[PDB]
């Protein structure tokens, strides 16, 4: 007996089902580490991350909600992105959109 223990049903959960996705190669050209959270507007990340910003427009990382991807200086990764939903309106970040898209 363990107080408050879970008996999780074994299996898997599919995330962001039915949503458009794309893959982009990213490289940290900066000299300091960069970590990006699941819901950040990927096209507006730190300018030291080099990738196809046009392809990334209106996308975020396709990872579990609340998690993040880390890029050490010089690190390269191909990341998977998922399109924003709802109204598809972007406000904040580096102030590059500030409206629909």
């Amino acid at each position: 007996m363990i107080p408050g223990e879970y008996h999780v049903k074994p299996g898997q959960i599919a995330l962001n089902t039915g949503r458009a996705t794309c893959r982009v190669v990213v490289e940290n050209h900066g000299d300091r580490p960069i970590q990006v959270g699941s819901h950040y507007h990927f096209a507006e990340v730190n300018p030291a991350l080099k990738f196809d910003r046009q392809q990334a427009a209106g996308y975020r990382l396709n990872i579990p909600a609340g998690t993040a991807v880390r890029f050490e200086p010089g690190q390269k990764r191909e990341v998977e992105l998922v399109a924003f939903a709802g109204h598809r309106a972007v406000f904040g970040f580096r102030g590059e959109v500030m409206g629909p898209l």
């Binding site: 007996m1 363990i2 049903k9 074994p10 959960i13 507007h41 909600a65 924003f84 939903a85 406000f91």
Partner: protein
């Protein structure tokens, strides 16, 4: 992409089909539904979801909630569901999916600049408890009940005076006025009971007009048919409830005589099993009746190997009996009965008893309503197995049946279910957050009207809030004018119409009771059974349709020595 269900449960709390053990009991809940969109859960923190332009939007305060409890596992009479909970203007705004409509799908709880976050992933969230058998013996009972997860206290008294030590009565306009004033200082919602025992209705109408939401008929003030009839007549006129502690002595009649005096009118029978008071040996038969809302008090919950020794002596001490007088011993033996104490647990399991309560410091423990309700559910699963209503390999229906006993059923009985008693839209945001290992015993956060009112708290001078010693400390929801905004004082319709709140300069928010007379046994959520119950005058055996109703006493209980320092 995919995530394993174990990793998902670790990150966001359990989802559909996962099971959780309630504290150290044998009770297991199963998540029935989950209102999220997988991948779009909101979590707060560094690099997390609830951040500007992400899970937090651009909306003005009028367009978002003031508080979101993220990833809560709700346990309520209506379901065991995973959801975000939104609170706005001190009330439950929605149960659903929180976030930002600008970038997320299916958002029903908008999060903005004006939104605070409570992280409920991995926690169980319930409504605040409602204890309707309070003796206002001392004000320290309020923090004691609040820490246990009880947010509303209905009862009577004036402090540590003989009348209050024995009865839940606040006698007369003067004491009623003083207690409504004192109530503003306590971090729980309060409604008062007046002294119901009189045969002149105007002496009752005056008390209701002064502020009481109900009248208590107690045998120590004469629980006669004429007094009961008078109190019910006034209750029917003024939309307030009558609570009853009947004539144990059978002085004025037997239980059938009190039932005839009630004459099918609505009444709340306190400690229906009878150890706490009532026609000896058969007050328990009141639970057969459609107009009776029956509660138990807690020292007899559940039946244990120390119950009888403890109670026989507890009664001898309270009543100054002395084991040497045969008639005092005959009285004590007619009131404390293993037959009815054992049957009571089964009657709760069957839904024939509808409420639990304390009887605070008057044959009852104010901090133990919730944990003893769960101890009964545990003992009943152990002895009886699955309820007939149970679907699936879980105890969900038994859990819903029992949580209703200290939440929605006391609220319906006392005409306050429009304000409190459940997690439902428009109700006051009285919520309790529990870590599953401490469910029912030691809550993580107790919320009053949208503000945290009490919670465990570690060293004040520490670098973080978690270092020792961790003990319950009152929070901002329990301070001065914030407390007043976040609690309710319940008044009768007559007191509200007469401007009692303004006259007494009551500072707290006011609510008015209604529906005290229309409520019946059939309205008790998951606990509407009207058994054909009998009690043998000689042996005290309880039978339903001639079948013996009994149980075995526990040697060891969960929610006990693993948790408490003393």
């Amino acid at each position: 992409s995919n995530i394993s269900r174990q990793a998902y449960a670790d990150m966001f709390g359990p989802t559909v089909g996962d099971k959780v053990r309630l504290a150290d009991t044998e009770l297991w809940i199963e998540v029935e539904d989950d209102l999220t969109t997988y991948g779009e859960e909101v979590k707060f923190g560094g690099g997390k979801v609830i951040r500007d332009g992400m899970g937090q939007g651009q909306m003005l305060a009028a367009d978002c909630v003031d508080l979101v409890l993220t990833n809560a596992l709700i346990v309520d009479h209506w379901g065991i569901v995973k959801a975000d909970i939104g609170v706005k203007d001190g009330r439950i705004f929605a149960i659903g999916k929180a976030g930002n409509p600008d970038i997320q799908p299916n958002v029903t709880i908008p999060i903005g600049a004006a939104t605070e976050v409570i992280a409920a992933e991995g926690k169980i969230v319930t409504a605040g408890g409602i204890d309707t058998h309070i003796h206002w013996i001392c004000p320290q009972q309020a923090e004691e009940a609040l820490v246990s997860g009880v947010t509303t206290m209905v009862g009577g008294g004036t402090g540590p005076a003989a009348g209050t030590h024995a009865t839940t009565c606040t006698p007369g306009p003067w004491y009623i006025s003083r207690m409504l004033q004192a109530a503003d200082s306590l971090p729980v919602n309060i409604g008062l009971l007046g002294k119901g025992n009189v045969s002149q209705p105007d002496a009752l109408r005056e008390q209701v007009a002064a502020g009481v939401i109900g009248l208590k008929i107690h045998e120590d003030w004469g629980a006669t048919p004429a007094a009961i009839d008078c109190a019910l007549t006034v209750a029917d006129e003024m939309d307030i409830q009558v609570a009853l502690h009947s004539d144990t002595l059978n002085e004025s009649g037997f239980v059938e005589d009190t039932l005839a005096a009630i004459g099918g009118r609505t009444i709340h029978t306190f400690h229906t099993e009878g150890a706490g008071g009532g026609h000896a040996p058969d007050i328990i038969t009141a639970c057969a009746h459609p107009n009776i809302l029956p509660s138990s008090t807690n020292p007899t919950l559940p039946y244990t190997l120390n119950t009888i020794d403890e109670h026989l002596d507890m009664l001898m001490v309270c009543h100054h009996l002395d084991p040497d007088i045969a008639e005092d011993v005959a009285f004590a033996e007619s009131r404390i009965r293993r037959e009815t104490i054992a049957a009571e647990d089964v009657l709760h399991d069957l839904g024939a008893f509808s409420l639990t309560s304390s009887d605070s410091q008057a044959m009852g423990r104010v901090g133990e309503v919730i944990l003893r309700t769960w101890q009964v559910a545990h003992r009943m699963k152990v002895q009886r197995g699955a309820l007939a209503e149970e679907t699936g390999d879980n105890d969900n229906f038994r859990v819903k049946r029992y949580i209703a006993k200290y939440t929605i059923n006391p609220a319906l009985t006392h005409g306050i279910a429009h304000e409190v008693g459940s997690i439902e839209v428009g109700k006051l945001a009285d919520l309790v957050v529990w870590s599953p290992a401490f469910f029912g015993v030691k809550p993580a956060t107790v919320i009053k009207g949208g503000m945290i009112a009490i919670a465990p708290m570690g060293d004040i001078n520490a670098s973080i809030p978690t270092p020792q010693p961790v003990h319950y400390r009152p929070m901002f929801g329990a301070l001065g004018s914030a407390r007043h905004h976040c609690r309710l004082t319940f008044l009768s319709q007559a007191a509200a119409a007469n401007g009692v709140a303004e006259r007494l300069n009551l500072r707290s928010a006011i609510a008015v009771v209604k529906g005290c007379r229309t409520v019946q046994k059939a309205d008790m959520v998951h606990n509407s059974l009207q058994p054909n119950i009998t009690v043998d005058a000689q042996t005290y055996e309880v039978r339903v349709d001639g079948e013996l109703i009994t149980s075995e006493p526990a040697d060891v209980l969960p929610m006990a020595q693993r948790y408490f320092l003393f």
